């Protein structure tokens, strides 16, 4: 009803951040597939550990990239009237947080004991 | 690549800066990320050696193998009070090799150790490459700056860092002397001039009193607070918002490292906004336990939260005047150095102490040392 050209600028920044989240989430998906591969592979217990702990640097790099997205989102100031922008920002933060929760479960499954 | 000019390098504790004198003016050179300052960070990974912004950006990922603060170790003995006190806070290992400290890391799967001047040489090599990428010419000659309180051993170790980095160190000059040269205080007509250099960074606070008589610089005194900087002002804001969140929501965010980091980053940026505006707004969705944190802070509240810290910057000023055997009325020029001198309240306190005397602040305070060094590098070329 009162959609402004100024909000289109904010929606564009959020769309560029959504594309960045989708790139990091594809890396997380590859990490999940490689983890399953090691778990359902023929590696002896000792070499499995090296393979699982080799995923650690990668998982930590995924967490960090998600943290940097959150810091970029946190630079935004959205007036109350920019309802669509506030919804897209909130939806995007919750999505990054759900992926960070998945990264945390991977971290609790590698380099253990 | 053709042979290029001589550069001025401010080799800093947490950040370094490189400048060049060309077409009658100094140009502060931006790095590959477009930043006019470069982190004095070196990281050792399983495959490569990262320097500068690339090393600082992966610090969370590789805390033990990411080295910084090598300036606090350079030219010092292992048993130095400074070395013993500072290593209690570093995430990387500091070992003793025949009385000399060495940083110990895992580099390409092997345990390796480096002397502080070897780490500083890697930072200098990065500064050399930043200049070379901008100029499109080979850079060999440099003027490198050191603190006025550095002894013979710390000065020599810095020159050795320059030599290992493949630089021809034209001169090692004091950081307060470099700031005074930037403003041409040695060229002003008149009698000897008493200059006060007020340096406030992210972690260190240094006050220096220089006398310039017939183009000769003489350090009369140095004072300061080695652990006082912008980071202390961020901490006060973080504590204020943690308390605010507790008052409103009855929840303690301080044990969630990621919530504290999101808050800290927002605070540091809000602090910078307060140097030009009287208010800064912060909006952080789902900060802790799904609660959105939308707030603001005025300059007045930021100043109240840091009142003791700001006022406290005047005690090393009085200490320096006492040691230099000078009254405040005998100070001809005051020079601002360091990012934190941009804070309006600090400028007001310093100006009121000198009964309304104008401050030399037109040159970016983060770049003033590099600026004076580039001028000196052009003079010696
Ligand atoms: C406006 N404006 N612009 C800056 N570029 C800057 C850097 N700083 C601080 O100086 C330190 C750097 O050694 C860190 O603690 C920075 O937060 C600042 N404090 C206040 N106002 C500032 C800055
Ligand atoms: Cl430039």
Numbering used by the authors:
A (entry chain B): 149 to 261
B (entry chain A): 1 to 381
Verbatim from the authors:
HSP70s consist of a conserved N-terminal nucleotide binding domain (NBD) with ATPase activity, a substrate binding domain (SBD), and a poorly conserved C-terminal domain which terminates with an EEVD tetratricopeptide repeat interaction motif123. The two main cytosolic HSP70s are the ubiquitously expressed HSC70 (HSPA8), and the stress-induced HSP72 (HSPA1A)3.
For example, the ribose 2′-hydroxyl forms hydrogen bonds with the side chains of both Glu268 and Lys271 and the 3′-hydroxyl interacts with Asp234 via the mediating water molecule, similar to the interactions of the ribose moiety in the ATP-bound HSC70-NBD/BAG1 structure. Likewise, the tricyclic adenine replacement is sandwiched between the aliphatic parts of the side chains of Arg342 and Arg272, similar to the adenine ring in the ATP-bound structure and both moieties form a hydrogen bond with the Ser275 hydroxyl. In addition, we found an intriguing difference between the HSC70-NBD conformations of the adenine/adenosine, 8-aminoadenine/8-aminoadenosine and triciribine fragment/triciribine structural pairs. By contrast, in the structures of the ribose-linked ligands, this loop is in a more open conformation in which the carbonyl groups of Gly201 and Gly202 interact with the α-helix at the back of the ATP-binding site. This conformation is similar to the one observed in the ATP-bound HSC70-NBD/BAG1 structure, in which it is required to provide space for the phosphate groups of the bound ATP molecule. Intriguingly, in all HSC70-NBD/BAG1 structures with ligands containing a ribose moiety that we solved as part of our fragment-based campaign, the phosphate-binding loop 2 adopts a regular β-hairpin conformation interacting with α-helix α6 and is compatible with phosphate binding as observed in the ATP-bound open HSC70-NBD/BAG1 structure.
